[PDB]
Design a protein around this ligand. Sequence first.
Ligand SMILES: CCC1=C(C)/C(=C/C2=NC(=C\c3[nH]c(/C=C4\NC(=O)[C@H](C)[C@H]4CC)c(C)c3CCC(=O)O)/C(CCC(=O)O)=C2C)NC1=O
Ligand SMILES: CCC1=C(C)/C(=C/C2=NC(=C\c3[nH]c(/C=C4\NC(=O)[C@H](C)[C@H]4CC)c(C)c3CCC(=O)O)/C(CCC(=O)O)=C2C)NC1=O
Ligand SMILES: CCC1=C(C)/C(=C/C2=NC(=C\c3[nH]c(/C=C4\NC(=O)[C@H](C)[C@H]4CC)c(C)c3CCC(=O)O)/C(CCC(=O)O)=C2C)NC1=O
Ligand SMILES: CCC1=C(C)/C(=C/C2=NC(=C\c3[nH]c(/C=C4\NC(=O)[C@H](C)[C@H]4CC)c(C)c3CCC(=O)O)/C(CCC(=O)O)=C2C)NC1=O
Ligand SMILES: CCC1=C(C)/C(=C/C2=NC(=C\c3[nH]c(/C=C4\NC(=O)[C@H](C)[C@H]4CC)c(C)c3CCC(=O)O)/C(CCC(=O)O)=C2C)NC1=O
Ligand SMILES: CCC1=C(C)/C(=C/C2=NC(=C\c3[nH]c(/C=C4\NC(=O)[C@H](C)[C@H]4CC)c(C)c3CCC(=O)O)/C(CCC(=O)O)=C2C)NC1=O
Ligand SMILES: CCC1=C(C)/C(=C/C2=NC(=C\c3[nH]c(/C=C4\NC(=O)[C@H](C)[C@H]4CC)c(C)c3CCC(=O)O)/C(CCC(=O)O)=C2C)NC1=O
Ligand SMILES: CCC1=C(C)/C(=C/C2=NC(=C\c3[nH]c(/C=C4\NC(=O)[C@H](C)[C@H]4CC)c(C)c3CCC(=O)O)/C(CCC(=O)O)=C2C)NC1=O
Ligand SMILES: CCC1=C(C)/C(=C/C2=NC(=C\c3[nH]c(/C=C4\NC(=O)[C@H](C)[C@H]4CC)c(C)c3CCC(=O)O)/C(CCC(=O)O)=C2C)NC1=O
Ligand SMILES: CCC1=C(C)/C(=C/C2=NC(=C\c3[nH]c(/C=C4\NC(=O)[C@H](C)[C@H]4CC)c(C)c3CCC(=O)O)/C(CCC(=O)O)=C2C)NC1=O
Lengths: 161, 161, 161, 161, 68, 241, 160, 160, 160, 160
Amino acid sequence: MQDAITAVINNYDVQGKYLDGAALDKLKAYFTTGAVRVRAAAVISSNATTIIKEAAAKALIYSDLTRPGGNMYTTRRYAACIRDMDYFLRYATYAMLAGDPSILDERVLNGLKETYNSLGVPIAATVGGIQAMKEVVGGLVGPDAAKEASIYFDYLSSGLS
Amino acid sequence: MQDAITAVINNYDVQGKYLDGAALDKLKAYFTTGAVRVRAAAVISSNATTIIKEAAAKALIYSDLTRPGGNMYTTRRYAACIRDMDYFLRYATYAMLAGDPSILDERVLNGLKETYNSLGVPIAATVGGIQAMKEVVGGLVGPDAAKEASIYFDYLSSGLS
Amino acid sequence: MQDAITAVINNYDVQGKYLDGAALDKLKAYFTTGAVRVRAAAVISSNATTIIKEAAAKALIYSDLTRPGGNMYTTRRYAACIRDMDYFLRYATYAMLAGDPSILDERVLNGLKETYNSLGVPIAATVGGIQAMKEVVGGLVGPDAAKEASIYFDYLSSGLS
Amino acid sequence: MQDAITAVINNYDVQGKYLDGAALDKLKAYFTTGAVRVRAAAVISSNATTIIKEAAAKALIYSDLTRPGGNMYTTRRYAACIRDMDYFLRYATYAMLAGDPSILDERVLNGLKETYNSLGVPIAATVGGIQAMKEVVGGLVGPDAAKEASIYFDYLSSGLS
Amino acid sequence: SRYFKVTACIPSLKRVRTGRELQNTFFTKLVPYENWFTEQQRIQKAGGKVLSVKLFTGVQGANTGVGA
Amino acid sequence: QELGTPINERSIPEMYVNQGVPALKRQRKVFKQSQATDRESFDALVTAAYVQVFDKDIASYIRSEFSALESRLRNRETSVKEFVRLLGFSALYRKQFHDRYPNTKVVEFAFKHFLGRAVKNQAELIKYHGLLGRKGIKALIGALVDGEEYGRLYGEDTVPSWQFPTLPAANYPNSVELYNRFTRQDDSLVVPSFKPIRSKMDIASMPLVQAALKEQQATKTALDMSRPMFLELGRSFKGAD
Amino acid sequence: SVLTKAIVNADAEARYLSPGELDRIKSFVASGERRLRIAQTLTEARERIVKQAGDQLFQIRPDVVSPGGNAYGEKMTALCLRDLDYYLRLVTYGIVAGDVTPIEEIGIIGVKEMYNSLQTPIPAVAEGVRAMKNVATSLLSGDDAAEAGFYFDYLVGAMQ
Amino acid sequence: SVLTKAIVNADAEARYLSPGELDRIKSFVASGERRLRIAQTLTEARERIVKQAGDQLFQIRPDVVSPGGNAYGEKMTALCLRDLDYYLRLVTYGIVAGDVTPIEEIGIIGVKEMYNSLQTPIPAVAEGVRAMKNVATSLLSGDDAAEAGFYFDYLVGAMQ
Amino acid sequence: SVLTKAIVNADAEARYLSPGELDRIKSFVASGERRLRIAQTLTEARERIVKQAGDQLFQIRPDVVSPGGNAYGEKMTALCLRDLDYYLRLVTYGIVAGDVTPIEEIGIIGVKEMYNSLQTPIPAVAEGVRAMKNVATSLLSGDDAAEAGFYFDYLVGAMQ
Amino acid sequence: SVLTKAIVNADAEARYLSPGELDRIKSFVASGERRLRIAQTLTEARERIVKQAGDQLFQIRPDVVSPGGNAYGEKMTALCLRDLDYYLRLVTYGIVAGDVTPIEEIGIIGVKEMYNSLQTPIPAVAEGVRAMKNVATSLLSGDDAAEAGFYFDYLVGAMQ
Ligand SMILES: CCC1=C(C)/C(=C/C2=NC(=C\c3[nH]c(/C=C4\NC(=O)[C@H](C)[C@H]4CC)c(C)c3CCC(=O)O)/C(CCC(=O)O)=C2C)NC1=O
Ligand SMILES: CCC1=C(C)/C(=C/C2=NC(=C\c3[nH]c(/C=C4\NC(=O)[C@H](C)[C@H]4CC)c(C)c3CCC(=O)O)/C(CCC(=O)O)=C2C)NC1=O
Ligand SMILES: CCC1=C(C)/C(=C/C2=NC(=C\c3[nH]c(/C=C4\NC(=O)[C@H](C)[C@H]4CC)c(C)c3CCC(=O)O)/C(CCC(=O)O)=C2C)NC1=O
Ligand SMILES: CCC1=C(C)/C(=C/C2=NC(=C\c3[nH]c(/C=C4\NC(=O)[C@H](C)[C@H]4CC)c(C)c3CCC(=O)O)/C(CCC(=O)O)=C2C)NC1=O
Ligand SMILES: CCC1=C(C)/C(=C/C2=NC(=C\c3[nH]c(/C=C4\NC(=O)[C@H](C)[C@H]4CC)c(C)c3CCC(=O)O)/C(CCC(=O)O)=C2C)NC1=O
Ligand SMILES: CCC1=C(C)/C(=C/C2=NC(=C\c3[nH]c(/C=C4\NC(=O)[C@H](C)[C@H]4CC)c(C)c3CCC(=O)O)/C(CCC(=O)O)=C2C)NC1=O
Ligand SMILES: CCC1=C(C)/C(=C/C2=NC(=C\c3[nH]c(/C=C4\NC(=O)[C@H](C)[C@H]4CC)c(C)c3CCC(=O)O)/C(CCC(=O)O)=C2C)NC1=O
Ligand SMILES: CCC1=C(C)/C(=C/C2=NC(=C\c3[nH]c(/C=C4\NC(=O)[C@H](C)[C@H]4CC)c(C)c3CCC(=O)O)/C(CCC(=O)O)=C2C)NC1=O
Ligand SMILES: CCC1=C(C)/C(=C/C2=NC(=C\c3[nH]c(/C=C4\NC(=O)[C@H](C)[C@H]4CC)c(C)c3CCC(=O)O)/C(CCC(=O)O)=C2C)NC1=O
Ligand SMILES: CCC1=C(C)/C(=C/C2=NC(=C\c3[nH]c(/C=C4\NC(=O)[C@H](C)[C@H]4CC)c(C)c3CCC(=O)O)/C(CCC(=O)O)=C2C)NC1=O
């Protein structure tokens, strides 16, 4: 994986360049937002379970999805689905700390679209589950962090569609 | 394409068999339901536009799908979507007359899943549009024809998922 | 896999239906033939080797198949072929006990047609090997069980062609 | 294994005692030496190969040990011996970081005396190889860390004799 | 070519377990010379005592034939 | 009543029966040595360890070559892990799953016979495939079986098994592809290598960083400081223009 | 079923069924009509069993139908009894299958995670499931009531 | 500790500690005196924390100290608070270790099986554990109260 | 970085980062400004560090610039200093990130095999790096010189 | 505000602001953005905060929502949460003002007389406010949670 900082280092390493003014400006733009990323992660982590619960309640359950014939019918599949939800939330929190989406590609999106096609897992319904968790997250983390958390949920959801 | 009758003829032709008792029984099972298929097609055809309107109203519009960022946003895409809906309805009516789903594969499903993935067209939302038209159709055509119309809508929808 | 008792349950579960009268009638139709299935399996199992021997003798060996240039030439390939034969016999015996062909799809037919195309294994010749074992089986198991054993051999053989 | 922080906890747990003043004083006595342990480990790790080379040169090679009839004769056994040396160095570095010798018992000394008796490996010669690496280590790590590194080499060597 | 015969006792420290499991915790067995060693580590890195080790197959002196 | 009935009829009940992992994940059995005491049972264990390593088709032909190995297992001289390892070092293994394939499919086949899955990431292919290039098959096998992963998952007795893994990304579908190919059905490498990903969002275009860079500009150019005003009053903001 | 569980053992050892395995299929299938009757009786009284289970449950623990209760209100209650209807259905399936395979995949594996999310109080649910045993069992002969009772106590067991 | 958890990774890969691993040991040990102060304060008020936790618990759920309650009576109560004293002790251990290794082996692995046997109601116990957080946290500075709070919420988490 | 290392360990365990796994990162952020500054300082004097490193090297090991030496000649020496310029660059990268990470992938994993092929004496490359430490360290304050020195000694360590 | 309070004391003693008064205006205004963030977060979660205070309240006092209780019934409960929504709003006002002037004139002076007339139990309104503190405080960083907490405890104090 890479973060903001290693994204820059590797982009310069392939050119064998010492870090110059443009590079140093990028890294500053990361460091200057760093404390806010940490606070936001502590809110998400400590509200993890409630975010999933409120996101499922707005976007998944009370529906045909949970009623025989639906993909989250059976305790078995309901558990798998909210398990997935926890992955998304947790990794988006990593991406936002790192300030780089590369981890969402390497460890979450790669092959996932076809995995879901192969099992029958409804893609559009999963995206709504992602964009509902974003909605909840953006309330909990506040002005400071709302836009920055949000983008990696949006990265996740256009990665499936 | 093939219908009930040519399905049987081609299955025997590859064995070079004259039609035997088992074959003749199958063909009877088609002919004996034939008049009912015709009446059902005349109801669907003549209510085509109302079925689409009621199916869209229950399963597509008044939603994020029709509001900026949604795939059926723009008059341009709204028109394409209900155009599609008309295809489904019309072809399902062909399949049900023929008593064979082969036309739904040859002229509708082949490549369509990936076509929709490539344009971004939401699959799950399209299935609901299919299963809503089925619901309306099953009311309009009555006891005689309800089960027989229904199956080719179900063929269409498990063809996408 | 599924069996007649299990299939009735999963077919109703997806509709969320209690078992009702129609379901209960199906299950009876299985239980009422159960003792006969068991006796038939004990005949097949205990005559396994003789059935393969008589089936090969009527439908495979004494031929170009066993001669140089033939697919069951070499002790290696002759062994592989009658090994296969044992699979078919054994699984058909499972399908007939279960009163459901689903195991023949899941664990025998899936990909087998193309596997045989890729190795050069003659399909038509293999079908004759299946329909010869059926012929022998139907003699050994008697009136009680003949039709019921036979169908899963016929399932196997139309699965390849 | 256990370390100074962990040992204090398990030593009190078996008595069911809260950590009290005496316990808290012990833990302080560890924390207050902690930074120095880390620096010392980084010197040992990064000079690993040179320490073995200088220790072997002072205490093992240029001798009957490396000549025919000697236990470190053959490239096989010479390799096994300096492989061992690396274990000792590496584990002593663990013990010194942990501030507890328990790992040297659990993962190094247990059964080793008899293992060496069974293979014929000369014990006294191995101790000199340990006490030569200590000598080198004590120069490289400096006043700060010399005594603390030294004791776990001495633990190792009285564990064999 | 050489083989060590070793006794190991490894307890379960996460989870308890529920069905017979007695050969999975205290066992003895011949192990090859090439591993016996990196399996000596896996056993001690999973918190297990190693009780006894015996040579079994080879000769203590060595030099030739060992390598096979 | 009706809040437990479907809403859209499941009208070809069957298409809805089969969605999910599939049935094979849970309709298969695990053989362990420790509850495979007694002769009847022990033969099953053994026969199922030839179906895990070797894979089914070619395990049908085994007759009695490994019979000295079986005696030792039967007599408790070696554990199930030793038996498994030793059957990977045998010439039959080597002939069947190594001699006819390129060295990167040898690693993949071995992953699925001794571990259950497919290669997880690329830092692995590299590790294990560069130990086969360096030392041949017996080191590749010896490594898989003595890993932490094998030990956690399988322990001393437990014949290895197919696990349908859930995590890392793509491990599940990669593995399920491997699992459902009969011997010689398809011999392509499934996981040839993991393509390296790229990056589509420059990191200074993100919101938090992007706005902390605008602020960075303002301060240096525009303004003065903590040194005496006389020094700050004769400063040029630009430097070369 | 007994078949699914057992054949699986056959295929996994690459062999035909044992005399033992064949015997149990025979004894099992002989006990078919009775098991079908047990399911019929209970299917026939499902609405009564659920409703009377629901009263027995809320006496033994009402708080769930109170201001801060998971099942507080008319439609939060319409769901709790619906879940009780679900589990009775699965119990009829189990009885006709002669084991839990179906009961398990449909309604216990994942049930902890589902209910923890909903913060339905699961342990109250076990008591609710237990009440259904009491009602259903009063509509069956002694012998059939015991045979049914094993499957009720299994579900009670799995929610644990 | 952090050491135990991390070194284990070193030995398992047959290697010396990484720069990363060395850095975290350094940052960890720098945070030592503070962690020791947090444990001292709580050790110093243990009897108050337990007692006030015990009142907070029985209001939020009294039934346990009633005729058919697991903790009914003077010596059935002397044991429930003693268990609360046990867990506060383990929480002080965890805080000074910087992880749960010790807390876990001593008092969560096996805890379901222990309490199920005793039929102590475990879920009431989680609430009791939660009460101690409230008391202990009111005797610590904001920063130290949070650091302590993570370990309380862990135990609450593990009884689940 | 410190970030990458922390996260990778987190994700492997599939649980959010700990509340203390948010202490090393905080230290690194404060450190990073200083770390960025040290790298810039090193970058400014690169040509002087390399050249003076190269003199210090050839005095201490004249054999590499001799008839049968890997660096014998004007253009076998030019490539040798270029390699010294490469490693100083990687050292600035390592310092700034706060974790060695990228340098390993760029210039130590595979370095034995590369130089063995070219027949370059590895331990005299390690000497060239010590020589650079000596020069670079004389252009930095005591505190910054130590912080830099760890990364020089790492490279020296990895070529071993 | 802090401004209003400082000035009123200034004008009443016929004088310019003190160094002290000037200092607090300066410290206050420096916390402006932070205080605005604290109000935003809580405004953003208002509906959730009232639904968790309301659950916490009805567990602790099921009687208020009982035959002879002031909040007994669906619309006597609806008004009760609306009052909880009122007080959360006033708490956001107080936090951005840095004192209670606004909170006080709007919702505590006269509150005894209002609720005595309606026969609302005042101390259980104080409990509803503690319940909101608990929820709101779990959506804020340690430092911001304390700053918010002072204003919650004030309202709890004034209903007394
Ligand atoms: C067949 C396998 C299966 C089961 C069992 C199942 C249960 C299930 N119970 C639900 C809700 C619920 N279930 C209950 C049940 C209870 N409340 C209590 O306090 C009692 C302990 C218990 C009644 C005995 C309640 C109160 C809700 C509503 C919770 C909410 O909406 O937050 C929901 C979400 C609503 C929905 O979309 O249907 C599901 C999916 N789903 C399944 O696929
Ligand atoms: C930006 C391009 C764009 C447009 C214009 C657009 C229009 C639009 N108008 C709608 C409904 C409607 N639009 C109207 C409009 C009118 N009724 C009248 O009699 C008048 C002639 C007219 C007002 C001047 C009405 C009454 C409905 C409700 C119809 C229904 O619900 O059946 C709907 C369905 C409701 C929804 O889901 O939003 C859409 C999508 N969508 C788009 O993406
Ligand atoms: C090159 C590798 C290879 C071999 C060896 C081979 C042997 C072979 N021997 C056969 C039959 C036979 N083989 C024998 C041989 C014997 N009878 C005896 O009693 C003696 C012991 C023995 C002569 C020494 C007999 C009698 C049959 C006829 C058996 C029958 O038709 O049932 C058949 C079946 C007839 C056919 O289709 O050709 C094969 C394939 N096939 C091969 O691909
Ligand atoms: C458990 C279900 C299952 C089945 C059924 C199965 C079939 C199967 N048959 C195979 C080959 C084969 N199959 C045959 C079969 C025949 N040769 C003939 O000429 C006849 C027409 C026919 C026998 C009647 C032969 C000769 C081969 C060897 C092809 C080769 O030389 O590679 C192979 C390739 C691997 C191997 O050689 O073992 C598979 C997997 N595998 C399975 O896992
Ligand atoms: C039979 C298997 C076997 C071999 C080969 C072996 C070699 C061996 N060579 C040694 C030293 C040495 N070997 C050499 C050899 C050379 N110097 C060069 O530059 C040339 C490339 C090369 C001569 C062709 C030198 C110079 C030393 C002394 C190194 C020292 O003392 O640091 C030593 C350490 C001195 C001793 O204790 O004997 C051993 C053990 N030992 C064995 O058991
Ligand atoms: C992780 C902790 C650990 C340790 C320490 C360890 C030691 C150890 N040393 C061994 C052999 C040996 N050890 C030596 C050591 C020496 N030869 C000498 O002459 C010197 C006195 C001495 C080096 C200073 C030699 C020569 C052998 C090979 C004996 C043989 O030929 O079989 C063996 C037998 C297996 C093997 O050959 O690798 C073990 C297990 N194993 C472990 O798992
Ligand atoms: C299927 C037949 C079978 C049996 C009976 C069996 C017993 C058995 N008990 C064990 C440990 C143990 N057994 C006990 C038992 C007790 N502690 C006490 O104080 C009491 C006196 C007693 C209970 C009445 C304890 C406490 C341990 C854990 C020892 C440790 O911490 O390592 C272990 C070590 C592995 C493990 O921890 O699970 C085994 C194998 N294993 C088997 O396979
Ligand atoms: C670490 C990164 C990672 C991810 C994200 C991941 C996803 C993932 N989801 C899976 C299944 C699944 N995923 C879902 C998800 C859902 N069901 C719905 O209806 C909703 C639309 C949705 C939840 C919002 C379900 C129901 C299954 C089970 C399918 C089955 O029954 O086989 C599986 C198959 C293996 C398993 O069942 O665990 C994987 C690997 N695996 C990974 O390693
Ligand atoms: C490769 C070298 C090697 C040898 C030699 C070997 C011998 C050996 N003989 C065994 C058993 C046995 N060995 C015999 C032998 C005999 N019975 C008699 O009455 C006669 C006196 C004698 C034959 C002349 C018998 C009957 C058993 C079975 C004991 C039992 O029932 O467990 C076993 C126990 C495991 C098993 O049953 O296979 C081993 C390991 N194992 C080896 O790995
Ligand atoms: C036994 C038969 C066999 C071959 C031949 C083989 C090749 C092979 N080359 C690989 C990578 C590679 N191959 C190269 C080769 C080159 N780079 C260049 O620029 C040059 C043009 C070229 C050398 C002349 C490189 C640089 C990589 C690494 C790609 C990466 O970073 O992932 C890999 C990926 C796994 C790994 O990294 O080891 C394989 C499997 N594998 C095999 O099993």
